[PDB]
Amino acid sequence: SMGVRKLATIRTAGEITPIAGAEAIECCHVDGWTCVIKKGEFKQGDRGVYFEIDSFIKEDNDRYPMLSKQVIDYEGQRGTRLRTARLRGQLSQGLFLPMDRFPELASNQVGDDVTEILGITKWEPPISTNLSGEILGEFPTFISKTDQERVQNLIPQIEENKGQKFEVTVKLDGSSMTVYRKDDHIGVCGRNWELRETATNAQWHAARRNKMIEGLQFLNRNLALQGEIIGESIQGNLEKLKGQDFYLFDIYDIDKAQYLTPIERQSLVKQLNDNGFTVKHVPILDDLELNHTAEQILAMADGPSLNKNVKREGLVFKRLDGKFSFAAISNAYLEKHKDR
Ligand SMILES: Nc1ncnc2c1ncn2[C@@H]1O[C@H](COP(=O)(O)OP(=O)(O)OP(=O)(O)O)[C@@H](O)[C@H]1O
Numbered sequence: 409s410m411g412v413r414k415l416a417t418i419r420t421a422g423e424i425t426p427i428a429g430a431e432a433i434e435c436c437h438v439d440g441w442t443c444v445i446k447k448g449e450f451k452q453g454d455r456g457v458y459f460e461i462d463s464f465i466k467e468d469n470d471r472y473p474m475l476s477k478q479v480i481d482y483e484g485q486r487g488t489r490l491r492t493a494r495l496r497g498q499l500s501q502g503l504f505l506p507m508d509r510f511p512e513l514a515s516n517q518v519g520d521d522v523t524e525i526l527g528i529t530k531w532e533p534p535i536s537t538n539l540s541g542e543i544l545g546e547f548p549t550f551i552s553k554t555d556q557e558r559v560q561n562l563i564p565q566i567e568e569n570k571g572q573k574f575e576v577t578v579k580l581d582g583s584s585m586t587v588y589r590k591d592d593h594i595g596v597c598g599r600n601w602e603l604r605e606t607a608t609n610a611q612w613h614a615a616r617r618n619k620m621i622e623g624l625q626f627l628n629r630n631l632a633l634q635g636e637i638i639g640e641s642i643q644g645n646l647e648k649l650k651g652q653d654f655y656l657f658d659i660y661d662i663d664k665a666q667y668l669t670p671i672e673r674q675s676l677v678k679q680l681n682d683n684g685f686t687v688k689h690v691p692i693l694d695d696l697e698l699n700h701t702a703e704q705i706l707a708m709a710d711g712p713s714l715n716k717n718v719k720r721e722g723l724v725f726k727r728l729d730g731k732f733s734f735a736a737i738s739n740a741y742l743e744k745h746k747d748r
Pocket residue numbers: 409410411532554555556557577578579580581582583584585599635636657690724735
């Protein structure tokens with residue numbers, strides 16, 4: 409998905425195959441996903457509404473009776489969190505429903521995002537106190553969010569980018585943080601909002617400890633430093649840090665409205681650190697020239713994290729021109745850490 413967008417989309421049923429023994433269900437490929445459907449629901453080529461994992465579907469027995477015994481109470485409301493599943497060891501991800509359940513979507517084309525009209529939201533794990541700040545204002549409209557699309561949703565784009573080169577980085581499991589300068593203002597943001605400085609806010613504390621506000625003034629440009637804050641009290645602290653710290657993965661050029669290329673970003677990190685502004689960067693793996701299937705890419709996702717004895721959330725791929733990127737999440741990670 410793209411943040412809170414594209415949780416529910418119109419998609420085309422792919423290859424459908426029988427499931428061993430179970431006479432009432434079958435396996436349906438939907439883009440790079442596989443999920444269990446009931447017999448009678450689809451033939452290959454049919455449209456359906458595909459709800460991606462992490463969708464939260466509020467209880468509705470008329471529309472979603474197949475979820476009635478999967479409901480939890482989440483943020484004060486009964487509904488179902490879609491999660492990675494297995495049936496006799498076979499991977500199933502997401503929910504694929506045929507169009508007869510959605511007569512009001514009959515004019516929607518393949519590719520349409522129907523998240524809002526269906527009221528689908530994204531499930532999120534609990535956030536610790538110091539990662540929720542005093543809201544200064546909106547996330548700046550002149551800075552891109554840090555959302556990354558999943559490789560499973562990019563099958564044609566993977567072929568379109570055959571032969572292109574990518575920076576491969578470890579996907580750290582923390583919270584997205586943006587520190588930016590635009591003319592006479594420097595701000596600190598979390599995932600969704602710009603935050604006021606307080607003595608206990610974790611994003612501001614990380615920005616202050618690494619001097620990245622003075623670093624932005626030194627660079628004297630309109631830039632957004634975007635990174636992951638990880639460590640104690642954040643997302644289970646996979647890396648076993650003491651304390652917290654910021655790990656850069658992108659720099660947004662505000663005036664040009666584009667990301668710096670990986671090489672441009674490496675040079676700015678070097679300039680920052682060489683001048684006393686200690687900014688760390690997410691782990692960088694070998695570059696990849698793309699000549700791969702989604703399946704091969706997903707088989708790259710598991711591996712050592714920043715802490716090499718823990719298994720990483722996955723990988724992010726950023727094309728060397730800065731203009732195309734995606735994430736490959738480790739399915740083993742999704743099945744191991746079921747509470748986030
Ligand atoms: N190396 C990296 N490159 C880019 N993003 C990264 C990297 N490491 C961690 N991240 C985080 O991964 C996110 C992109 O993945 P995605 O869009 O799936 O969000 P997410 O991790 O599910 O969101 P959240 O955990 O905030 O709910 C970024 O918003 C950023 O917080």
